[PDB]
Amino acid sequence: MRPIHPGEILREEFQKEMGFSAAALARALGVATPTVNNILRERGGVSADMALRLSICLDTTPEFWLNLQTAFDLRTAEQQHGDEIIGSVQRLVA
Amino acid sequence: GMRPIHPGEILREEFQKEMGFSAAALARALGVATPTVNNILRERGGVSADMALRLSICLDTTPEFWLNLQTAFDLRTAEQQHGDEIIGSVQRLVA
Amino acid sequence: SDIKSVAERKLAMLDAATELRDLRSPPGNRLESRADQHSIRVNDQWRLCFTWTEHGPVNVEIVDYH
Amino acid sequence: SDIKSVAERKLAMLDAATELRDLRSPPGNRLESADQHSIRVNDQWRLCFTWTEHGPVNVEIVDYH
């Protein structure tokens, strides 16, 4: 169905109920505030590094965040370039 | 988590070695520039969501299969290189 | 806000979860009950029930108490 | 080449797999057989497993002789 950016989870499922600003989160993770806001505003992705910081900060697994990023990049790709790719790629394996 | 396993290692050892294609032949099947396949085979760069789809269609796999290997590799790497640094830095906001 | 959108997001998290903490930690989930069935809030009316296994959420249901 | 390194790699693939095709397609797996299937680690050892919607389960090693 729709691509779900890991930033939507961070914003809707953590930030809203907790209340922290982008800066507070950024301070906790040890990263520059624009890194967090890129994510919160869904304009950039979550690196393995960011995922580690998030998982330690928010008591989750780092794979939780990378799985969301993976599902997001993949749904996006699929509905941007899917037909272009399925129509053109040569099949080398039965 | 043991050693990090780059998806390039799977590509090279579990497909290329038994099938026999050259980097350029795979690049031609995927519809990408040959250096992009080298990058991966020589484990010099990651696999994108786009490259994952092309591989999955080309080699009869799922795209997630390739991204999962990329995930685990990026994550083992980060934990080896920056893990002890990060776990001593980050402030916990959630019980 | 929209209930469908929230549902989509909850399903997203369920599929992405690697450990029970992934569902317990987000305060938006308001997780309630480790092998017993748990549930996460979708809204004031609907909750997703499920069982946690090593291999992720199983037997996902909706329940409206009551 | 090294059996340890091959095992580590087969294990990686099992954990990453999402559909049976992920384990059947790579010819280096030489996959053989909802029933149990197995993949070649080398001439002597194979990883047995049952495929499930939730990935590989009951993973074991077998040396057929």
Numbering used by the authors:
A (entry chain A): 6 to 99
B (entry chain C): 5 to 99
C (entry chain B): 23 to 55, 60 to 92
D (entry chain D): 23 to 55, 61 to 92
Task: Recite the paper's sentences.
We determined the structure of the GraTA toxin–antitoxin complex at 2.2 Å resolution. With one His-tagged GraT monomer bound to each GraA monomer, a GraT-GraA2-GraT hetero-tetramer (hisGraT2A2 for short) is formed. Binding of GraT does not affect the structure of the GraA monomer but the relative orientation of each monomer in the GraA dimer is somewhat displaced. GraT binds on a negatively charged surface area of GraA, which is located opposite to the DNA binding surface. The contact surface area of one GraT monomer with GraA2 is 488 Å2. In GraT, residues S27, E30, R31, K32, A38, R43, D44, S47 and G50 are involved in hydrogen bonds with the GraA residues R7, E13, E18, D64, T66 and N72. In particular, A34, M35, A38, A39, P48 and P49 of GraT interact with a hydrophobic pocket on the surface of GraA formed by I9, I14, F19, M23, L63, F69 and L73. In GraT, on the other hand, the first 22 N-terminal residues together with the 6-His tag are located in an interstitial space and could not be traced due to lack of electron density.
GraTA (Growth rate affecting Toxin–Antitoxin) is a type II TA module recently discovered in Pseudomonas putida. By sequence similarity, GraTA is most closely related to the higBA TA family. Here we show that GraA does not contain unstructured regions and forms a globular dimer while the toxin GraT contains an N-terminal intrinsically disordered region that is key for transcriptional regulation of the graTA operon as well as for the RNase activity of GraT. GraA binds tightly to the graTA operator and GraT prevents this interaction through steric interference from its N-terminal disordered region.
